[PDB]
Design an enzyme around this catalytic site. Structure first.
Site, short mmCIF file in Angstrom:
data_model
loop_
_atom_site.label_atom_id
_atom_site.label_comp_id
_atom_site.label_asym_id
_atom_site.label_seq_id
_atom_site.Cartn_x
_atom_site.Cartn_y
_atom_site.Cartn_z
N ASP A 1 -15.02 22.83 22.86
CA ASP A 1 -14.84 21.85 23.33
C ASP A 1 -13.91 21.04 22.17
OD1 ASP A 1 -16.19 19.77 21.29
OD2 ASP A 1 -15.32 18.18 23.17
N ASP B 1 -12.27 18.47 19.46
CA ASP B 1 -12.31 16.98 18.86
C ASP B 1 -11.73 16.06 17.45
OD1 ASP B 1 -15.26 16.67 20.17
OD2 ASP B 1 -15.76 18.33 18.60
N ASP C 1 -11.68 15.73 23.36
CA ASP C 1 -12.26 14.36 22.86
C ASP C 1 -11.22 13.79 22.04
OD1 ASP C 1 -14.41 14.61 24.73
OD2 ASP C 1 -15.96 15.28 22.77
#
Ligand code: MN
Ligand code: MN
Ligand code: MN
Ligand code: MN
Ligand code: MN
Ligand code: MN
Ligand code: MN
Ligand code: NA
Length: 326
Positions: free
Chosen positions: A194, A196, A250
């Site tokens: 992912d 961030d 995120d």
DNA sequence: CGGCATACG
DNA sequence: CGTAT
DNA sequence: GCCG
């Protein structure tokens, strides 16, 4: 020799004991699947110790005096040194329990507790879960729908593109706001699961209300496949050659007064931050989180202008992000 | 033996 | 219960 | 599982 806390030692991203640490991290993961947080921590710490060594372990005697190596982790290493494999680790790898808990917990929206319940109900595969979607949360439906893309590593080239689009939306939502890449990519990883980002603004308080404005704008640009405040766990639509793929992103907001603590916390690693907070509390009597550092004697918070400030206030030598890969 | 990081959604 | 480092 |  080798200090006991991971935040007391540089841990680079690549190292000289990859096979040994991977094996111990299998046992750590399996411990977590059984609810043994204590054993998970010990195996994680033992693995990280090996990552911090300056050369390969070739003989069992080289483990003497290393923190977090006792009978069990030493026997794992001994077997790997003698036979190239550890029977316990291989038994875990091929067990139906481990494989299914790994598969289920890697779904966005599914934790150990949910995975374990499903396992006890007899469920084993993703299609088992798709057949009865009435029992899924919206978050799990998203995680399951996008599971294949989310299992594909995010590349550093993907990151630069995502950062550009996040900044565009952030700049419209609040002129002057900044976007900082955190997580594993800030530690130097070339791929990740992912992306961030940490968002702030140089004028304390101007960041209030910012994340909903950012999200509404991203959503209006058609970039948000899923979202649910100051932390947003999203699935982005990332352009690809002639198509696109889903990517977990995120987005986090912090006021500039807290930015160094949130940068530190969101840059990780997870084990590094746990060890750093443990060190702070148990060795220095101070309470650390991603908002601040609290002295419970004086009942005061430590003002930090940088990560360097925080390391200094804890009596630790500074470690750049690329040496926080515990 | 107790502890094991500490938050937010 | 999930999520994050 | 290991530590202090
Ligand atoms: Mn044992
Ligand atoms: Mn043998
Ligand atoms: Mn990450
Ligand atoms: Mn993340
Ligand atoms: Mn907050
Ligand atoms: Mn005990
Ligand atoms: Mn992570
Ligand atoms: Na999950």
């Amino acid at each position: 020799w080798m200090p006991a806390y991971a935040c007391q030692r540089p841990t680079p991203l690549t190292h000289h004991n990859t096979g040994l640490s991977e094996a111990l991290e299998i046992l750590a993961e399996a411990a977590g699947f059984e609810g043994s947080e204590g054993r998970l921590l010990t195996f994680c710490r033992a693995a990280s110790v090996l990552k911090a060594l300056p050369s390969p372990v070739t003989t069992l005697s080289q483990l003497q005096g290393l923190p977090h190596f006792g009978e069990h982790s030493s026997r794992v290493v001994q077997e790997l040194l003698e036979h190239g494999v550890c029977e316990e680790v291989e038994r875990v790898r091929r067990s139906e329990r481990y494989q299914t808990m790994k598969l289920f917990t890697q779904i966005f929206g599914v934790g150990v507790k949910t995975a374990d319940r499903w396992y006890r109900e007899g469920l084993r595969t993703l299609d088992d879960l798709r057949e009865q979607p009435q029992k899924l949360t919206q978050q799990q439906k998203a995680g399951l729908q996008h599971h294949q893309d989310l299992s594909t590593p995010v590349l550093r080239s993907d990151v630069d593109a995502l950062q550009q689009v996040v900044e565009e939306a952030v700049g419209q939502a609040l002129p002057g706001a900044t976007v900082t890449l955190t997580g594993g990519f800030r530690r130097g990883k070339l791929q990740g699961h992912d992306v961030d980002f940490l968002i702030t603004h140089p004028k304390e308080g101007q960041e209030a209300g910012l994340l909903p404005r950012v999200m509404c704008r991203l959503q209006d640009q058609g970039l948000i496949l899923y979202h649910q405040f100051e932390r947003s766990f999203c699935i982005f639509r990332l352009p690809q050659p002639g198509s696109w793929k889903a990517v977990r992103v995120d987005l986090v907001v912090a006021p500039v007064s807290q930015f160094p603590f949130a940068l530190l916390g969101w840059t990780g690693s997870k084990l590094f931050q746990r060890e750093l907070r443990r060190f702070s509390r148990k060795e220095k009597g101070l309470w650390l989180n991603s908002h601040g550092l609290f002295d419970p004697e004086q009942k005061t918070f430590f003002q930090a202008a940088s990560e360097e400030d925080i390391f200094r206030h804890l009596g630790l030598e500074y470690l750049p992000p690329e040496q926080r890969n515990a």
